[PDB]
Design a protein around this ligand. Structure first.
Ligand SMILES: */C(=C/C(=O)OCC)[C@H](C[C@@H]1CCNC1=O)NC(=O)[C@H](CC(C)C)NC(=O)[C@@H](NC(=O)[C@H](C)NC(=O)c1cc(C)on1)C(C)C
Ligand SMILES: */C(=C\C(=O)OCC)[C@@H](C[C@@H]1CCNC1=O)NC(=O)[C@H](CC(C)C)NC(=O)[C@@H](NC(=O)[C@H](C)NC(=O)c1cc(C)on1)C(C)C
Lengths: 299, 299
């Protein structure tokens, strides 16, 4: 076919999602146990202008909050700021809480996103952590608080919650420890992202996958050592390769070694001229060896 | 927010998915009410040689099957052909059956896929029905029985099951009417597909997306009238575009009209000349207007 960006399934998350409001602010909250996490800015009286939190947490009549799963409401007990995330102890443990574990995504790691609009999940798509800690999601008005999750061996991990969008378009969110990814703040301010660093690990996988679906026009006898490639890497914003390991697998199923790809990269780093790979016209790093292996002829 | 192929939640569908064996043959199945639906080739003795489904059904014996969710088995009390879909009556009603209707997908229409392996849901991704009634499902071995479905107004529609992959890589499945999309057959026989006919509506949606995602190079002050475009199309493997009416929303939001984008197509169809569009190296038609609107600035 191609290679296409899948998402792992979502049924385990959908019940834990709710509609948290507060004033004119309607968004989505995650509901695990008697807790309900969500972007803090829901409290803020005017999100369209620099925010003074603290101040805002000082006159927040808990009775005004408004949580609901479908048209079935919930009562609020406490609420504690935790990083950029807001916590709400509700008066009704969630019967659908999924066995899980929290973590955070390192750059170049793929993960699923479940965009929601006022408590209702609307779509499911996988994404990827850019070097600067932002994602090219596809968020818009009302998807704040959407949840991002991963599964690694029957373990459902919660890793992301959506907050805001940069001036350039990139989407910013927090991990569940209350940490906004990329250190960005929850302020309608002009904040920069800084150059994006292409994930080498992930670009190699992309090329392997290409071979796999019978695509080779971009592979020629000639090769670069991790050394060499590594240099160039440091000049054209590509992560660096530590061990040609990882790909031994693919390197076998296709006989071609990384070395032969690192060269490809460099040739390809300035357009495919008129050709394409897996339908892509430029190099892509949204996939990880895991995905190529799991997606392609494999587990 | 660039443009990503998304899927709709897998929540409702995920329970419904079961594992079916008969023989050396294992796949996936769908469990609704007291019935389980799965490809009838499950029963075919040797699935690598021409099959006679009537000789096979002739030697079928219930106790020879196997149906289960998790490791909990169900008792088959009946099995039958309805076209190419094997329907199986079992001793138990799925308590998790969701309010559902059935339906058929038309060319150019998109829908969600839950690629499953031996009973377990493993991923969700959107797809698009090609002119020839096939799709580029990223289907592998062990995915047979994978279910397709859509959600409209809040009604769940089951519309696809999987069966086989053509010699050209494309993927063929069946509607729940027991009909094989494309009129293909569950025979390991050499069946061609026939040159593909792109979706003009979907391609226009695509270009609108790009414009909304801030791309313009391919923009010129040129325009091709409707009738003019359709004559070009009918001889260029693009579908007749019978109504710019579907494009009013996007048109007003970008300032560009279908006719301007029409000419863009005739031009761009001659290869992007080296550049890319929304990262693709050539034209895409796997995005309906509906998706682009809903997905971009709009509902
Ligand atoms: C979710 C909330 C929503 O629906 O609010 C309606 C009022 C957004 C999600 C956002 C919508 C589009 N895609 C998305 O992901 N949350 C926000 O609106 C945040 C709120 C802050 C309190 C954190 N706002 C923004 O993302 C906005 N970002 C900008 O502020 C960027 C940084 N800024 C600019 O470069 C600039 C100038 C001015 C004035 O405001 N921003 C976005 C501009 C709406
Ligand atoms: C899902 C089943 C599975 O579990 O297989 C276990 C072997 C079905 C999956 C395929 C695999 C790749 N993607 C995908 O969707 N498929 C089957 O294996 C079917 C079964 C038969 C009984 C319908 N077979 C195929 O899809 C084959 N299709 C071919 O028949 C193709 C048309 N081939 C030729 O031109 C030709 C010549 C001979 C001999 O066979 N095909 C593929 C080739 C396995």
């Amino acid at each position: 076919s191609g290679l296409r960006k899948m998402a792992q399934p979502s049924g385990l998350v959908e019940p834990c999602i709710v509609r948290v409001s507060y004033g004119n602010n309607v968004l989505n909250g995650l509901w695990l146990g008697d807790e309900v996490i969500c972007p803090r800015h829901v409290i803020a009286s005017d999100t369209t202008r620099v925010i003074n939190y603290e101040n805002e947490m000082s006159s927040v009549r808990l009775h005004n909050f408004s949580v609901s799963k479908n048209n079935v409401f919930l009562g609020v007990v406490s609420a504690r700021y935790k990083g950029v995330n807001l916590v709400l102890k509700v008066n009704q443990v969630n019967p659908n809480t999924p066995e899980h574990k929290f973590k955070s995504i390192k750059a170049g790691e793929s993960f699923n996103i479940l965009a929601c609009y006022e408590g209702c999940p609307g779509s499911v798509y996988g994404v990827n952590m850019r070097s600067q800690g932002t994602i090219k999601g596809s968020f818009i008005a009302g998807t704040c608080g959407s949840v991002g999750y991963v599964l690694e061996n029957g373990i459902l991990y919660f890793v992301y919650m959506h907050h805001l969008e940069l001036g350039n378009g990139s989407h910013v969110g927090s991990n569940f420890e209350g940490e906004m990814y990329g250190g960005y703040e929850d302020q309608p301010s002009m904040q920069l992202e800084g150059t994006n660093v292409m994930s080498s690990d992930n670009v190699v996988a992309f090329l392997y996958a290409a071979l796999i679906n019978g695509e080779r026009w971009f592979v020629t006898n000639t090769s670069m050592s991790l050394e060499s490639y590594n240099t160039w890497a440091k000049t054209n914003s590509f992560t660096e390769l530590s061990s040609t390991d990882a790909f031994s697998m693919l390197a076998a199923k296709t006989g071609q070694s990384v070395e032969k790809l690192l060269d490809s990269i460099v040739r390809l780093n300035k357009g495919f001229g008129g050709r394409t790979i897996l339908s892509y016209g430029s190099l892509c790093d949204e996939f990880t060896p895991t995905e190529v292996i799991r997606q392609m002829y494999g587990v």
